[PDB]
Amino acid sequence: AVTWTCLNDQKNPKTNKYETKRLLYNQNKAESNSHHAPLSDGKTGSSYPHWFTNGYDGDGKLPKGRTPIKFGKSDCDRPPKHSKDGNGKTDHYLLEFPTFPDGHDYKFDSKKPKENPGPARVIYTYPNKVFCGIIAHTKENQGELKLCSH
């Protein structure tokens, strides 16, 4: 359906240089992976799906240098009322699952061991899970998560 593509900088060990590769993700897989994982902030093996601060602190306000990934939604931009385990009575926090391009459902339940996650991640509310988009770290898997574009 939709093709969420991101541009992450990979430090190729062969060339010891940073290259900007195009990480194409299939929304169908993101909206699917997210429709497989349980809706609970840090309550699984790999912890995932973990609450996505989205720049927020866990209430609605943002720390020093407010940079909340703007998806273009009112609920995705809404204050993510993240509780203890982000699982109250009707918690509406923005979760961030590590979505894969292959379209597999990474073992997010596998605590130990637990292979390294992915750069591009799926973002979606709860329990609505109104798939907002995919975001990836323009610098490998750490740099500011730039909302991929389809």
Swiss-Prot record:
Reactions catalysed, as given in the entry: a 28S rRNA containing guanosine-adenosine pair + H2O = an [RNA fragment]-3'-adenosine-3'-phosphate + a 5'-a hydroxy-guanosine-3'-[RNA fragment]
Alphabetized UniProt keyword annotations: Disulfide bond, Hydrolase, Lyase, Nuclease, Protein synthesis inhibitor, Secreted, Signal
GO molecular function, a single term: rRNA endonuclease activity
List of catalytic residues: H50, E96, H137
Basic and acidic residues compositional bias, start-end: 72-92
Gene Ontology cellular-component terms listed: extracellular region
EC supergroup of this enzyme: lyase
Enzyme Commission no: 4.6.1.23
GO biological process: negative regulation of cytoplasmic translation
Cystine residue pairs: C6-C148, C76-C132
Family membership noted in the UniProt record: Belongs to the ribonuclease U2 family.
Role summary: Alpha-sarcin is specific for purines in both single- and double-stranded RNA. Its toxic action on eukaryotic cells is the result of cleavage of a single phosphodiester bond in the 60S subunit of ribosomes. Inhibits both the EFl (elongation factor 1)-dependent binding of aminoacyl-tRNA and the GTP-dependent binding of EF2 (elongation factor 2) to ribosomes.
Name recorded for this polypeptide: Ribonuclease alpha-sarcin
Native organism taxonomy: Eukaryota, Fungi, Dikarya, Ascomycota, Pezizomycotina
Gene designation per UniProt: sar
